[PDB]
Design an enzyme around this catalytic site. Structure first.
Site, short mmCIF file in Angstrom:
data_model
loop_
_atom_site.label_atom_id
_atom_site.label_comp_id
_atom_site.label_asym_id
_atom_site.label_seq_id
_atom_site.Cartn_x
_atom_site.Cartn_y
_atom_site.Cartn_z
N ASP A 1 68.12 55.73 1.01
CA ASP A 1 66.96 56.17 0.23
C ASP A 1 66.73 57.64 0.56
O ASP A 1 66.53 58.00 1.72
CB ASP A 1 65.73 55.33 0.61
N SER B 1 56.42 51.66 -2.20
CA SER B 1 56.20 53.04 -1.75
C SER B 1 54.81 53.22 -1.09
O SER B 1 54.48 52.47 -0.18
CB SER B 1 56.48 54.02 -2.90
N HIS C 1 65.25 54.50 -4.27
CA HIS C 1 63.85 54.32 -3.90
C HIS C 1 63.19 53.16 -4.66
O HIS C 1 62.26 52.55 -4.15
CB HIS C 1 63.06 55.62 -4.12
#
Length: 271
Positions: free
Chosen positions: A219, A97, A248
């Site tokens: 996602d 991320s 995710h």
């Protein structure tokens, strides 16, 4: 005896051995346990460094939230300190991320310390423009924000399945709730604001080290076009792989697909 919270907040752990070091960073609402299905497969060939970030492990005997954690630039700076204090010479950085972006920012400053970057579920910006598709309109962002401090107990149980995807019964969704519940309500809110206000798109052209860019095809936080965006805008060599998975956090929810993809990109140069 005297005290020092910088070791405790970072929570640095080293395991394995080899000529090359692999550094593992993580995303919002989780911790270094997210890499549990990856680490066992790196240790024979690599020294592995893990660390914590984005307000992880807030409810503890000694965790003061410092003012360098207000922006992603400060996390990037703190990463460069970690690399210096453990005398890393070249490294394979793997970022999940927004820790992918913090690694990217640090590699602009010290590209000699990075052999490559492996991005997973990464995005330079979540919010939309007329021309750019981040994936979120302002309504979506404030909807998620509104419920965070009204009750953190109920927000986590609604938010956690939404981000991870699939059924709620899985250990992946429960593990993410467990790590979310280690955070405080107030710290998670200030961190949440930083996530969704962040815009790192201008930095990408300055990145010169090789980047491998990996994500799920479904996602909710990252539209599939974002991998291509990063690929076209980075300044050095790069490659893209969209996995046919959901979520995710695919390293925790779909390891059977995610882990072998990660190992390929870590072990091989861009062929």
């Amino acid at each position: 005896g005297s005290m020092n919270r910088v070791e405790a907040a970072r929570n640095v752990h080293i395991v394995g051995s080899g000529d090359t070091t692999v550094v593992l960073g993580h995303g919002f609402g989780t911790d270094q346990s997210v890499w549990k299905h990856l680490v066992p497969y790196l240790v024979d060939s690599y020294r592995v460094l893990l660390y914590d970030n984005m307000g992880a492990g807030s409810t503890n005997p000694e965790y003061f939230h410092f003012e360098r954690y207000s922006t992603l630039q400060g996390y990037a700076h703190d990463l460069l300190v970690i690399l210096h204090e453990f005398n890393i010479r070249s490294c394979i950085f793997v970022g999940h991320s927004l820790s992918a972006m913090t690694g990217a920012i640090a590699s602009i400053i010290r590209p000699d310390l990075f052999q490559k970057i492996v991005m997973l579920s990464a995005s330079p910006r979540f919010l939309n423009t007329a021309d750019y598709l981040g994936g979120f309109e302002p309504a979506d962002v404030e909807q998620l924000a509104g419920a965070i401090e009204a009750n953190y107990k109920s927000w986590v149980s609604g938010f956690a399945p939404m981000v991870v995807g699939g059924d709620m019964d899985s250990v992946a969704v429960q593990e993410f709730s467990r790590t979310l519940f280690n955070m405080r309500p107030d710290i998670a809110r200030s961190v949440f604001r930083t996530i969704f206000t962040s815009d790192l798109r201008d930095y990408l052209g300055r990145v010169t080290v090789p980047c491998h860019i990996i994500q799920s095809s479904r996602d909710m936080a990252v539209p599939v076009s974002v991998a291509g965006y990063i690929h076209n805008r980075v300044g050095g060599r790069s490659v893209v792989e969209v996995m046919n998975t959901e979520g995710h956090l695919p390293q925790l929810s779909a390891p059977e697909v995610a882990i072998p993809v990660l190992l390929r990109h870590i072990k091989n140069d861009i062929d």
